[PDB]
């Protein structure tokens, strides 16, 4: 026996260390159903159609038809041409402290969103506006996962890779928080006020597009903050002790932990709100950056020495990456090899795998 029987000689630079990180697609489970063929993914355990054209057909692009004249269709009604009820003659925003009568159908749907964040996300959260059309968001599975976690746990830490598009889900989450909660102050912190403003900006766009029965009245619409009639608000701040101490956040979102200089100081001021006290919700998303403060935060959470709930999502979350150039499901065998060749294995890991160096 000069050599083994059934190995597989296919090469992948991703399996070039003391481990097999990616399995060849030929080894996957397959099945026929509905006239098409399906492959089960190794990342998901879920079933995908062999032909990319069919994954496309299962994830349609629902366009949102503008409506400003038919209130009965409350799911999309928006009193745009009624200046009396607009926040400063703006078309997409509702004024504050304005009353209206509702049907039982409306109330129940409102309560349905308040308790099912994923429903609210797949049903009313829209993207764009002036180009290609106002459409529903195409939520990815990893995004549903985060909405659910962030929703149920008080403290959350996310270790993500780049290229995933996480700000969309973050924007959706905060839009939900201030929309269904009263008198809650939210604070967005980041390395620079610039990054905070964009997260806030994205959150406003998701709010502007909500239909009137779900959109609260705007009491303030600034570039660095907003406030609603239900007393809730959101402000963009530059991670610093003062920002934290001069406020009473009910929830804090920290984008970039891993790359915040002198995080220990900001961290110090925050634990008061995190620990024994009002116990505000704290959500931190980030991508790994060496063995710094974040390494000992993630570590404490992955083990279970922190109250923080750990969540991780890497390159294989964008499902279109699982289909090769021939438009055939290969579980990302080709998208990783290509991406690597176009750069490096070293670079791939710190960009698509959330590894720590």
UniProtKB/Swiss-Prot annotation:
One of its GO terms (biological process) is viral genome packaging. Keywords: ATP-binding, Endonuclease, Hydrolase, Magnesium, Metal-binding, Nuclease, Nucleotide-binding, Viral genome packaging, Viral release from host cell. A motif (Walker A motif) lies at residues 161-167. Changing residue 253 to A/G/K/P/R: Complete loss of terminase small subunit-stimulated ATPase activity. ATP binds at residues 138, 143, 202. Residues 30-94 are annotated as: ssDNA-binding. Belongs to the Tequatrovirus large terminase family. This is Terminase, large subunit. The gene is 17. The chain holds residues 1 to 357 of 610 of the full protein.
């Amino acid at each position: 026996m000069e050599q083994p029987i059934n190995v597989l000689n296919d090469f992948h630079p991703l399996n070039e260390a003391g481990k097999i990180l990616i399995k060849h697609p030929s080894l996957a489970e397959r099945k026929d159903e509905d006239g098409i063929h399906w492959i089960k993914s190794q990342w998901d355990g879920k079933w995908y159609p062999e032909k990319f054209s069919d994954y496309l057909r299962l994830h349609k692009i629902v366009k949102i038809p503008n409506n400003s004249d038919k209130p009965e269709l409350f799911q999309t009604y928006k009193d745009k041409n009624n200046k009396r009820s607009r926040y400063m003659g703006l078309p997409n925003l509702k004024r504050a402290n304005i009353k209206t009568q509702w049907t039982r159908e409306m109330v129940e749907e409102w309560k349905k969103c308040r308790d099912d964040i994923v429903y609210f996300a797949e049903t009313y959260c829209a993207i764009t506006h002036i180009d290609y059309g106002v459409i529903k968001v195409q939520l990815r599975d990893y995004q549903r996962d985060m909405l659910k976690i962030m929703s149920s746990k008080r403290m959350t830490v996310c270790n993500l890779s780049r290229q995933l598009g996480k700000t969309t889900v973050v924007a959706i989450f905060l839009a939900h928080f201030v929309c269904f909660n009263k008198d809650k102050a939210v604070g967005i912190l980041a390395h620079k006020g610039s990054m905070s403003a964009e997260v806030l900006d994205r959150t406003k766009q998701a709010i502007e597009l909500l239909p009137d029965f779900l959109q609260p009245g705007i009491v303030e619409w600034n570039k660095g903050s907003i406030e609603l009639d239900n007393g809730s608000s959101i402000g963009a701040y530059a991670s610093s002790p003062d920002a934290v101490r001069g406020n009473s956040f009910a929830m804090i979102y920290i984008e970039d932990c891993a790359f915040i200089p002198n995080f220990h100081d900001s961290w110090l001021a925050i634990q008061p709100v995190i620990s024994s006290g009002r116990r505000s919700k704290i959500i931190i998303t980030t991508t790994p950056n060496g063995l710094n403060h974040f390494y000992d935060i993630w570590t404490a959470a992955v083990e279970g020495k922190s109250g923080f709930e750990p969540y991780t999502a890497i390159w294989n979350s964008v499902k279109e990456r699982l289909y090769n150039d021939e438009d055939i499901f290969d579980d990302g065998w080709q998208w990783s090899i290509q991406t690597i060749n176009g750069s490096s294995l070293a670079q791939f890991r710190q960009e698509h795998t959330a590894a720590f160096e």
